[PDB]
Design an enzyme around this catalytic site. Sequence first.
Site, short mmCIF file in Angstrom:
data_model
loop_
_atom_site.label_atom_id
_atom_site.label_comp_id
_atom_site.label_asym_id
_atom_site.label_seq_id
_atom_site.Cartn_x
_atom_site.Cartn_y
_atom_site.Cartn_z
N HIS B 41 -8.33 3.76 2.02
CA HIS B 41 -7.22 4.70 1.89
C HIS B 41 -6.45 4.56 0.57
CE1 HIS B 41 -3.73 2.15 2.96
NE2 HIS B 41 -4.44 1.63 3.96
N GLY B 143 3.08 -1.71 1.31
CA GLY B 143 2.48 -2.48 0.21
C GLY B 143 1.64 -3.66 0.68
N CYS B 145 -0.87 -3.49 2.82
CA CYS B 145 -2.25 -3.04 3.06
C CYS B 145 -3.24 -3.79 2.20
CB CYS B 145 -2.36 -1.53 2.84
SG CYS B 145 -1.41 -0.55 4.01
O1 LIG Z 1 5.49 5.08 6.62
C1 LIG Z 1 4.34 5.24 7.00
C2 LIG Z 1 3.25 5.72 6.05
N1 LIG Z 1 1.95 5.11 6.27
C3 LIG Z 1 0.97 6.10 6.75
C4 LIG Z 1 -0.43 5.54 6.85
C5 LIG Z 1 -1.37 6.20 7.64
C6 LIG Z 1 -2.64 5.69 7.81
C7 LIG Z 1 -3.00 4.54 7.15
CL1 LIG Z 1 -4.59 3.87 7.40
C8 LIG Z 1 -2.10 3.87 6.34
C9 LIG Z 1 -0.80 4.35 6.21
C10 LIG Z 1 0.26 3.54 5.46
C11 LIG Z 1 0.80 2.44 6.37
O2 LIG Z 1 0.78 2.54 7.60
N2 LIG Z 1 1.32 1.37 5.72
C12 LIG Z 1 1.91 0.21 6.28
C13 LIG Z 1 1.19 -0.89 6.74
N3 LIG Z 1 1.72 -1.97 7.33
C14 LIG Z 1 3.03 -1.99 7.50
C15 LIG Z 1 3.91 -0.96 7.09
C16 LIG Z 1 5.31 -1.00 7.28
C17 LIG Z 1 6.11 0.01 6.84
C18 LIG Z 1 5.56 1.10 6.17
C19 LIG Z 1 4.21 1.19 5.98
C20 LIG Z 1 3.33 0.17 6.44
C21 LIG Z 1 1.43 4.44 5.07
N4 LIG Z 1 3.95 5.01 8.26
C22 LIG Z 1 4.21 3.75 8.96
C23 LIG Z 1 4.41 3.78 10.42
C24 LIG Z 1 5.56 3.51 9.51
#
Ligand SMILES: O=C(CN1Cc2ccc(Cl)cc2[C@H](C(=O)Nc2cncc3ccccc23)C1)NC1CC1
EC number: 3.4.19.12
Lengths: 296, 305
Positions: B41, B143, B145
């Site tokens: 991703h 960040g 990931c």
């Molecule tokens: O704020 C988002 C955007 N996120 C969508 C998304 C959708 C699918 C995938 Cl595979 C990755 C992603 C990213 C993701 O989930 N990153 C993260 C990982 N680990 C911890 C986090 C803690 C706070 C914020 C992001 C985190 C980005 N969603 C999160 C549910 C709050």
Amino acid sequence: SGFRKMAFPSGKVEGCMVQVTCGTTTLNGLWLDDVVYCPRHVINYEDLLIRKSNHNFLVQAGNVQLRVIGHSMQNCVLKLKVDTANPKTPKYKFVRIQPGQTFSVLACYNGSPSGVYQCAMRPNFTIKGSFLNGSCGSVGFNIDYDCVSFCYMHHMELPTGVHAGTDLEGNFYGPFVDRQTAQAAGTDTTITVNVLAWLYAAVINGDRWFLNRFTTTLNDFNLVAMKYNYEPLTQDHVDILGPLSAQTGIAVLDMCASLKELLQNGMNGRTILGSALLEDEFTPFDVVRQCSGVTF
Amino acid sequence: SGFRKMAFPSGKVEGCMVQVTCGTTTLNGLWLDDVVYCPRHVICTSEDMLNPNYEDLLIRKSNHNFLVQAGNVQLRVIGHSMQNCVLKLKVDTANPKTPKYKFVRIQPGQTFSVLACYNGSPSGVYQCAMRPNFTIKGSFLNGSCGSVGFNIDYDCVSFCYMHHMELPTGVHAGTDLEGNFYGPFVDRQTAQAAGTDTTITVNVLAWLYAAVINGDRWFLNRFTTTLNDFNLVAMKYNYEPLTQDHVDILGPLSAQTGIAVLDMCASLKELLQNGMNGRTILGSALLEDEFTPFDVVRQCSGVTF
Ligand SMILES: O=C(CN1Cc2ccc(Cl)cc2[C@H](C(=O)Nc2cncc3ccccc23)C1)NC1CC1
Ligand SMILES: [Cl-]
């Protein structure tokens, strides 16, 4: 999201762990530059040390044997001058911590690190650690940027299963001595400023059921806290909690009124951050670091 | 004495963490030999996440689109390929700090250490378990990931997890190092939720044996149970079914303490029925399930108190 007991990355400390053998005793040492630091009980310590020569101390760094060229004592710590400087010596300081402060422990056996965990210096100067025979000389540390601050060296286990040790200058934390005698840990207290910090971390992670409309005075809070074996909360503690109070919109004496209600009424089948007990081994700075993303 | 949640020393893994940037996205990568492994991703925008066609996004990229940073040194990407949900970036330099390693896929209930990173810089280490619902209750921010889970039994690093995303309940989902997700999750911003979680029964039993080893027996009783009767009660408290494999795995701990697995099962039944009544077990007021039978034998003494 999430709230775990997090230790600092241990790599800079792993590169300093060595095995020290003197006669029948084998424990761990910290190799920084051309000096190896370890508990003096590996050997009247001045009378025992005067009878030893450099070759009596066997120091092992991985498979390599280090040659001892000098030796001296500083309080309860033995300093072994070696012929080789540690190429993996990081930037470091020796710091003495206060009760309530937290640190990471790299637990070792035979100069080999086996685990890392986070813990706090209790108000009674003991640490509730996890150590077996051979763990002596395992160290406690914090990392600030690239600099490793060494704050603890393990010396012994007390009869209740808790641990006692020194700073890296050989000065013990607490009224303990390094020998077999009748010594016990004093009655322990809860680190109030740490419990408050952890309640602020719960609010940051979306846990607010314990919040109420009430506020209190510092004096009234301390009268209640003293009854539950909680450390007195000082004006310095209130100032230190300032950033967390501004981030959540809950004044420190507003959060103290929540802690007072949890102390008198309990949790009533509910948990805070997955815990049924009030957690006191996260300082205000740990909460800000874990809920901000500070890297090393 | 003492019983702490202990993580493996993270040094062997710290020497592999790198920063991967593709356009506006920046996350962590694992540099082993001349390959950098990271979540696929990284090639996505926030918009792409709803219905991303990774093959279509990847075909449009060249090697110089991926920026890899190892400390202050810029690594040059010379190739790229996708394996399931992981992107593999061939670099021109092999990692001199590459430890002995294996890629292992774990089963629910298994534990591992997590080195949490941001911008290719490790910031903390913690121990956790793969939940029965395939999620991990971690502590991750935006960040993180590409942060990895591992075990270091002997001198070998077994990589078992790479962080990919956070679910709406605050729990985390990710893949093994071959890009195969744990659980029914997709690296897609879809309406996906973690299934109902259950307590890892074999782990709670192991932790009860660890309390008996460290000197605590207040929770023991004079009863035994059949395996079937224990599971009928355990299912009522959202505890995972205890299998004959779990009973076999607890064999050494039973022999060391002199308490048969089904007699320890009877104590667990009674603890579920009564609670702790103001008492704790190994400093805990809840029944702990993130220590496996293997972790207990590793951490605890071989001599019972
Ligand atoms: O704020 C988002 C955007 N996120 C969508 C998304 C959708 C699918 C995938 Cl595979 C990755 C992603 C990213 C993701 O989930 N990153 C993260 C990982 N680990 C911890 C986090 C803690 C706070 C914020 C992001 C985190 C980005 N969603 C999160 C549910 C709050
Ligand atoms: Cl497994």
